[PDB]
């Protein structure tokens, strides 16, 4: 799992009747999952070490 994140939370009182705000976020992420676990193959997983 790998990610590069960013966040800007902003909150502002404009005048005596208005208040605005924003919560901006974003990321670039790379995932990869070991997608043979949970099943029985020959030399795979902890079943393979056993």
């Amino acid at each position: 799992f790998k990610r590069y994140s960013g966040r800007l939370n902003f909150e502002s009182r404009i005048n005596e009747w208005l208040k605005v705000g924003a919560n901006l976020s974003g990321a670039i992420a790379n995932r990869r999952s070991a997608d043979y676990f949970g099943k029985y193959y020959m030399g795979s997983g902890t079943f393979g070490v056993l």
Binding site: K39, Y40, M42
Partner: peptide, 13 residues
Amino acid sequence: SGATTATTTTSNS
């Protein structure tokens, strides 16, 4: 990869 060894119990919950 490889050959699949059978007789599993199907997981629910």
